[PDB]
Amino acid sequence: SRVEEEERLFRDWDAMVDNPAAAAKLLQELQPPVQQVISHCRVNYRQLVAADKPGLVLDIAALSENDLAFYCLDVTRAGHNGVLAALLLRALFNGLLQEQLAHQNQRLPELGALLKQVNHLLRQANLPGQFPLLVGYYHRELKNLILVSAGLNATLNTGEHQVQISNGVPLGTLGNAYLNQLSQRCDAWQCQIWGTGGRLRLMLSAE
Amino acid sequence: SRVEEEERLFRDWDAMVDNPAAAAKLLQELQPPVQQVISHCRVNYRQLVAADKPGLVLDIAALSENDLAFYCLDVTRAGHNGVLAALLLRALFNGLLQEQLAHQNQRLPELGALLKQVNHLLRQANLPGQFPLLVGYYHRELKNLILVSAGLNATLNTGEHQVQISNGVPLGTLGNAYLNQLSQRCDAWQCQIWGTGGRLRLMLSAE
């Protein structure tokens, strides 16, 4: 179905660019389930206010049997272009990170470099605006969590460790390098992400 | 004088182990100046309450012409052993990090590995207790700041980015790996560190 969702995102893209209602409706239908198992990890997601319109959106998916990645985007800053950016990320984000790891001999993710690539992708898709974005990577065996924020606020709790991040440089500008990085080793974590568009909660545990 | 201070720390160590008043008096005299230039960086330090007794102590020094490192230790958790640990770190911390970089082909610091080494050093110096410690690295040309906390709270402000960290695992236990890491690229930053023992402020700018 994720494979099938990728085909509808590719085939219907032009129709979604010209129909904001349809694009927003599909974006709401593509939200993660409340709980799932990804790469031997329990993953729980919920918006902290029950709403019908997309504000802060999230996607999370496996990169291999043993690691996963996620992105979180505030679509309200760029309006329709923000919704389209979320749909574009849903189609290509995981594949872009998988390609970068395929060129890294030890599969050590460079989320800052990925954000630079996403910035270029948004330009080449003709999606101007500002896109507050948070990207994360987790490996179930190494127990390593990596977080990079570009314009979003976030709290990370691992029990022994607590971090609050508030980055003010969203994606969408020409020459910003996004190099803040939080790396944390943990077996479980709870993360809350928020911006103007809303606030969500994402938690992870071993299966 | 820093070279000369290293010789008195080595020669008088045994006398300081047996005289807590002398050890604490020397520790207070070894605090950083209010402002200095280290590795082409302005460095400003102040305790946020004017006090005579050591609580949260800091040292910062160059690793080369272009980078520097610092540590911050709450000496009140282990009492006299905490004061001694600070004196031991003042003597050896910079040299230990310089040796680690000499074995890394690109001089990429591993502050988590350094903390593991410091934990072993405290054991071999026969200094039991708990030692809340924060270590930092900054490179003036790459503009990269790295922070790792083991039991201390800290806020980092770079203008575009703000981070609050509160780690609960101080040094002194047997088998803790210390792997939280904040990496941030910035030209200037202001950092406030605190624990039970007190609170200090450290800021950096280009010279």
Residue numbers in the entry:
A (entry chain A), B (entry chain A): 102 to 308
Original paper wording:
The structure of the RssBC was solved at 2.1 Å by multiple isomorphous replacement. The RssBC domain structure is a mixed α/β-fold with five α-helices and 11 β-strands and can be further divided into a mediator/connector domain (residues 131–163) connecting RssBN with RssBC and the actual C-terminal protein phosphatase (PP2C) domain (residues 164–337). The N-terminal part or connector domain of RssBC comprises three small α-helices (α6–α8) which are arranged with approximate angles of 90 degrees to each other. These helices are connected to the core domain by salt bridges, hydrogen bonds and hydrophobic interactions, but the conformation of the very first α6-helix is likely misaligned due to the absence of the structuring RssBN domain. The α8-helix connects the mediating α-helical elements with the C-proximal and structurally conserved phosphatase domain, which consists of 11 β-strands and two α-helices. The core structure of this domain is formed by a β–sandwich comprising two closely interacting β-sheets. The two β-sheets are stabilized through a hydrophobic core structure formed by conserved aromatic and aliphatic residues. Indeed, the effector domain of RssB exhibits a PPM/PP2C phosphatase fold, however it lacks the active site residues. The conserved residues (between EcRssB and PaRssB) are mostly located in the hydrophobic interface but also include two positively charged surface exposed patches, one of which is centered around the putative phosphatase site that corresponds to the peptides 90 and 91 from the peptide library and hence may play a role in docking to the ZBD of ClpX. Based on our peptide library analysis we propose that the ZBD of ClpX interacts with the α10 helix of RssB.
In the case of σs, a specialized adaptor protein RssB, also referred to as SprE, is not only required for direct recognition of the substrate but also required for its preparation and delivery to the AAA+ protease, ClpXP. RssB is a response regulator (RR), and as such is composed of an N-terminal receiver (REC) domain and a C-terminal output domain (also known as an effector domain). In contrast to most RRs (which contain a DNA binding domain) RssB is linked to a protein binding domain, and as such represents one of the small groups of RRs (~1% of all RRs). Nevertheless, like most RRs, RssB is phosphorylated on a conserved Asp residue (Asp58) within the N-terminal REC domain.
